[PDB]
Write a structure and sequence with these properties.
InterPro entries: Peptide_deformylase, Peptide_deformylase_sf. The protein has 3 helices and 7 strands, in the order αβββββββαα. It has 165 residues and is of the alpha+beta class. The protein has one domain: Peptide Deformylase (Alpha-Beta Complex), CATH 3.90.45.10. It is globular. Bound molecules: cobalt (II) ion.
Length: 165
């Protein structure tokens, strides 16, 4: 099922997700509905906070063929290095993009859809996406790295887009 994605300035986007206690059938259904939502909204990542599920669950697919499902449940950053940035967008900040500073490379550990622990070293786009999604789980949005003026402008633009419906 396609779930509703929250848009700024919704305060639910600022909530800190709790760790998933056990990866059971219910959590698998949430992961599957998150992928269906992410692909329906044409995105490359989605954090459960964005669909009002306040648990540490992230789905990502940065592949060209849209057939490489990455699940991060209870992710933890182990190492990072370098700096980079691209003009990021966000399904919760429709049609707005901005360059934000990110680590170039990261190493994380997390649980997959079967509840199995794994480690992943990422660079390039994947590293940026993992950082963006992990920020959503602690109530942080990419606009938070921008100047207060730019945050104001981005919020005003999104409210206008939504008003027009
Ligand atoms: Co986002």
């Amino acid at each position: 099922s396609v779930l509703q994605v929250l848009h700024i300035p919704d305060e639910r986007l600022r909530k800190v997700a709790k760790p998933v206690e056990e990866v059971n059938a219910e959590i698998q259904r949430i992961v599957d509905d998150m992928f269906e939502t992410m692909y329906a909204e044409e995105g490359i990542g989605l954090a459960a906070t964005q669909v009002d599920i306040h648990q540490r669950i992230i789905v990502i697919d940065v592949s060209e063929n849209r057939d490489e499902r990455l699940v991060l449940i209870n992710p933890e950053l182990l190492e990072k290095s370098g700096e980079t940035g691209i003009e990021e967008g966000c399904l919760s900040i429709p049609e707005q993009r901005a360059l934000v500073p990110r680590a170039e490379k990261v190493k994380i550990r997390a649980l997959d859809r079967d509840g199995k622990p794994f480690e992943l070293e990422a660079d390039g786009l994947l590293a940026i996406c993992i950082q963006h999604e992990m920020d959503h789980l602690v109530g942080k949005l990419f606009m938070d790295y921008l100047s207060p003026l730019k945050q104001q402008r981005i919020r005003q633009k999104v409210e206008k887009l939504d008003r027009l419906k």
